[PDB]
Design a protein around this ligand. Structure first.
Ligand SMILES: N[C@@H](CCC(=O)N[C@@H](CS)C(=O)NCC(=O)O)C(=O)O
Ligand SMILES: N[C@@H](CCC(=O)N[C@@H](CS)C(=O)NCC(=O)O)C(=O)O
Lengths: 202, 202
């Protein structure tokens, strides 16, 4: 059975959406309303992913895989000739896992208060301040090489690109950002990235 | 030359501390003050880890590994005879990665606002309600087999055990916890876990 990605336009599921197109694998996509927990076909989303989140990926055996970090590694390992991630058993792969975790916990989850309407503006200010330093730090790494893990685009870039879009949408102040902005411009040119954004009607 | 772990007692660094002992690897440990950013020996911690957090592992080549999720996988892969995680490329490995990410992003990072005095009280209430649901979800999974990933103890259990201790220290409300509680008692009886806790003076 063909892989299916459950997504919501602009959410963190854009990351494995980009990876799927970079990978060349066959897949379909299915949009989810995150409030109603219904998919675009009317189906009950909690019946599919009990965690009620995107992304979730239906594998070719019918089983479900959740968590962006797990999904992009699963995909990249499926197409080793495309080198979307360092091979397993290498120190480089542990560094990739390191950066994937940083993005997931410090960038991605860092945004959570900003997307909750019940969050008092005084705290949002504090939260934005922390993200400033986190992205500024990322900028300092992007000063040393073209992509996050080095000279080549990787699944970690798909994830970073995705959450960096949120920073832009929320007009996040970022102290050091000249390399980050140039990087965002570079990644945005990739045909797979553009195809992902179009398919999500962005 | 042997591996060294930077840690603070009962912090998330307890997780790889446990894994090191479960793994039977030779290693030393070294404590870190998270305010002054000074190790127990004098050194500047920001020199060592610029993100200024524990855990951080010093590998044999002298290099540093950060992010607990990366550290525990590195250690597990080093001792396949101990079967502390499924081997790379297997579906079971992706489910372990999935759980590790859930623990890092949904449980671990969920605690951060609760320990921070700048968090508004009503945001803390929202966070507690979410952790109630997330731990209750974990509890329902633990009804199915002895440990988190199946019948065998794994690095995901070291991590889960570590963050669940915080739930207990805060007396967090968890609606379905009968399986979680039995699990916690079982894990706390493991010789490696006792030695970790004792070495950290807890
Ligand atoms: N730990 C999950 C977090 C996924 C996540 O936060 N998804 C958001 C979209 S950005 C979501 O689905 N929110 C809906 C909800 O939490 O109810 C992962 O890393 O994949
Ligand atoms: N993203 C890191 C988070 C690690 C972390 O938050 N460590 C805490 C201890 S529980 C810490 O060292 N805090 C000190 C600080 O933030 O300055 C990881 O997943 O390993």
């Amino acid at each position: 059975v063909m892989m299916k990605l459950f997504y919501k336009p602009g959410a963190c599921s854009l990351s494995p959406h980009i990876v799927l197109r970079e990978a060349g694998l066959d897949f379909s996509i299915e949009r989810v309303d995150l409030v109603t927990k219904k998919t675009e076909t009317g189906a009950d989303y909690l019946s599919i992913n009990p965690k009620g989140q995107v992304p979730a990926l239906v594998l070719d055996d019918g089983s479900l895989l959740t968590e962006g970090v797990a999904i992009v590694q699963y995909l990249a390992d499926k197409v080793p000739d495309r080198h979307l991630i360092a091979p397993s058993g290498t120190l480089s792969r542990y560094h990739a896992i390191e950066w994937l975790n940083f993005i997931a916990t410090e960038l991605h989850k860092g945004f959570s208060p900003l997307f909750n309407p019940n969050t008092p503006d005084e705290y949002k200010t504090i939260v934005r301040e922390r993200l400033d330093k986190q992205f500024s730090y990322v900028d300092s790494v992007l000063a040393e090489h073209d992509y996050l893990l080095g000279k080549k685009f990787s699944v970690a870039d798909a994830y970073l690109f995705t959450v960096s879009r949120w920073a832009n949408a929320l007009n996040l102040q970022i102290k050091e950002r000249s390399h980050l902005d140039q990087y965002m411009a570079r990644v945005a040119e990739r045909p797979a990235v553009k195809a992902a954004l179009a398919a999500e009607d962005i």
